[PDB]
């Protein structure tokens, strides 16, 4: 049973939920966590969806080495200056020191792009569109949090190279829309699409697009996925070049994008939908969508037979169902065990209901008990699974809609901010003003994104909240992971 | 096309095949390789088959950290003694030296088994059947060979814990049969199932089962996959203990297996089926089974357009029938470039569409394995191509099988053994099983590289005679044992 309240001590609740659902185990080392099968199945669902979608775009899977040389890692000064502090270095095998230290990848730009330079000889070799599903390492010394912010994590990283800027800019937004679909369609989490400010953009890229989610329980926002236009910054450094088809002998540098999505997804799901009885799984990603549980000697065998009847009908219509007919456990124990793991529907079959040709469906999101005729089993349960998905999104949506507001001045900005909300404010865009906002609001508020579709229209002559410069865009600010 | 020839310079031939088929690219770290999409799709095909199979056995996928602590890594002393010289060690982040160095997994027994010990509190907590698809590092200073022996590689490793020995013993053999299926039914490579000698078994384990494949071109055999029975050696070190009410008060130690398969599969496929024209993909793993190429579109717009339409028609029809078909309709590459390009990549069937054949309602199919061309009635497209593909998969197996059959023979004396081994063959000999004898065989065969034990076959070529002496002459033989030059 769960023993911490989400609205009292959030960290204690998070720990409780992820371990009692059997999603996470703690490793010997700190900041390193084990994805047990209940969590990993959510990641596999995401992968199935996203992998099919990127295949539709022409992207292909590959696998690049986990180690990068010192020379490659250093070639793009801004990138390396941003990542160097947290790069992990291997220096020996056994007692034998290596010829040269080698780095574990924090991101794959510098392991892939010498190869791209090799593969791109002429215009017809482009575009190159590659993806890999792998693990990466960001050995920061700050406090790690399972799923949300870890030292090793699983992700997908895509890397594309194009002959023209237009193709590249188009892919950036196609990928970002896919990420939005993962969050909203699969995990029932609303997200805000936007661009990162100059201070928060990917080091070495030209611009970064992103989706931001809101964790109401802590009043904080978190980046869910990211899609960069790197432009020609990396291709100039790695010499990914092709001869201009029109102008003899002129070399052109490829235009590049990279884009990433991680198991942070599962953490957000958990923070957004979890409750005080445990995890709550959106049906669209649930490993088990329905769990059949008997309640209450010809009658005992008839009851288990009926349970099986329900299992086979639900499987017949492609609903993911488990019948927990274990005799080694109590029915109430089974109830709690599967509520903790977040199974969308509990299907209870007891003797009275069975002789009456009905069963009970219990929704996880609301706890509501429905009695359903045996006749309707497949149809109604399908309906209910869809309602759960919608309900989960709707509630989360309402939270976003009440916790993201507009503020045109610094005083109202501060007041709103420490009520636990995020705030769209008119912003001039300068790094100096962003730093100043951070300290004056101190955790201090960071920039989250410049919304594609902001709440209000910026009006002519609007000044930034610093008063010094004119406003360039409504920008979403808040406390962040 | 290709330059080096397989029978002349095998290492050069192999380098050329894997790069010109765009399977492999060299990394800036010497001895490190990139799996390009054409190679990774074979890995994905193998993963699809085997992942489905082990889910039918109750195995669940998961993911454990890449890093191991000093504490855990030493808790089974023989396992760690076997792996320690090739364990990579992380010693700093950025410029900051770590208080404690941390090791990269060479294999995850020492990452997972502390967790197993936490999760097992009773016999209803068993079995635990977990698998992960990941990468491991074995940083040996011998020189690597792409796919076959690398410092980092992808694999799957499955780890099971059971209350009784009977269940564990059954799983060892079920997984081993699945690996034999991967090799024989997916990659068209015949294998020998067997058990490893005491010298070659998994350090700290009880016994190791294995599948061995023969590479005719080099006369060397190679271990294709392994399925260990770890008994209670690891549960006793990591205290994976449970109590059964059946046995009051006694802490019982789980019975454990671990099993693995890697991208070495692809190298073996390359070494077995490749020829002097390039790679040869078995149809069952082929990313593209059938490539459609229009021929002779040259300097009427209507007839070129109709040629395109007819190619797309073949495309639609072969999709209709679960054939993985791709039409290469690019205008910026000539037809000969495409013929060569897809032959190098090993596409089982080339389907050529010319204007004369289009107007005469036929096409030409070219089988990659034999090169034979076939004019085929257009209506039979869907049905004959299927047939051809099945025949290809069989032919690849048949040829490989007869290779193995003629290169695996029996001998009972060290002189016959040496002659046969210098023939480029592998040998079943009566063997006493002792480690010192295996060391002596390897020294003597080298000059007196050396021959290594490969496996003790489940089904040897001959029944061992009662009272047969090992080829060492000192001790009685325990079993027929396959020996050979090996990777
Ligand atoms: C699990 C996860 C996720 C992410 N990030 C980043 C942005 C991004 C997005 N969007 C990446 C592009 C994909 C994301 O998911 C980042 C991380 N670790 C770290 O920063 C390292 C670390 C370690 C311990 C404490 C604090 C920080 N850990
Ligand atoms: C690609 C691949 C495969 C395998 N091994 C092992 C046995 C096994 C089987 N069966 C694994 C347990 C599953 C296998 O495939 C092993 C390896 N590297 C190494 O030994 C490291 C190395 C590096 C450079 C030179 C020499 C040696 N590299
Ligand atoms: O780390 C990042 O944010 C980018 C996106 C995936 C590849 N690198
Ligand atoms: O390395 C090995 O051979 C065993 C099997 C996979 C996990 N450990
Ligand atoms: Ca940093
Ligand atoms: Ca209850
Ligand atoms: Ca060793
Ligand atoms: Ca034994
Ligand atoms: Ca006791
Ligand atoms: Cl509602
Ligand atoms: Cl200011
Ligand atoms: Cl003696
Ligand atoms: Zn300002
Ligand atoms: Zn002997």
UniProtKB/Swiss-Prot annotation, chain A:
Residues recorded as bearing Phosphoserine in the entry: 330
Region annotation Proline--tRNA ligase: where it falls in the sequence: 1-481
Effect on the protein of changing residue 138 to K: No effect on prolyl-tRNA ligase activity. Decreases inhibition by halofuginone
Impact noted for substituting residue 138 to L: Almost complete loss of prolyl-tRNA ligase activity
Any single Gene Ontology cellular-component annotation: aminoacyl-tRNA synthetase multienzyme complex
GO MF annotation: an example: identical protein binding
Binding sites annotated in the UniProt record for L-proline: 107-109, 138, 228
Keyword annotations of the record: Acetylation, Aminoacyl-tRNA synthetase, ATP-binding, Cytoplasm, Disease variant, Leukodystrophy, Ligase, Membrane, Metal-binding, Methylation, Multifunctional enzyme, Neurodegeneration, Nucleotide-binding, Phosphoprotein, Protein biosynthesis, Repeat, RNA-binding, Translation regulation, Zinc
Assembly with partners or alone: Homodimer. Part of the aminoacyl-tRNA synthetase multienzyme complex, also know as multisynthetase complex (MSC), that is composed of the tRNA ligases for Arg (RARS1), Asp (DARS1), Gln (QARS1), Ile (IARS1), Leu (LARS1), Lys (KARS1), Met (MARS1) the bifunctional ligase for Glu and Pro (EPRS1) and the auxiliary subunits AIMP1/p43, AIMP2/p38 and EEF1E1/p18. Forms a linear complex that contains MARS1, EEF1E1, EPRS1 and AIMP2 that is at the core of the multisubunit complex. Interacts with TARS3. Interacts with DUS2L. Component of the GAIT complex which is composed of EPRS1, RPL13A and GAPDH.
Domain notes: The WHEP-TRS domains are involved in RNA binding.
Stated name of the protein: Bifunctional glutamate/proline--tRNA ligase
Species the sequence originates in: Homo sapiens
Lineage of the species this protein comes from: Eukaryota, Metazoa, Chordata, Craniata, Vertebrata
Gene: EPRS1
Covered range of the whole protein: 1015 to 1512 of 1512
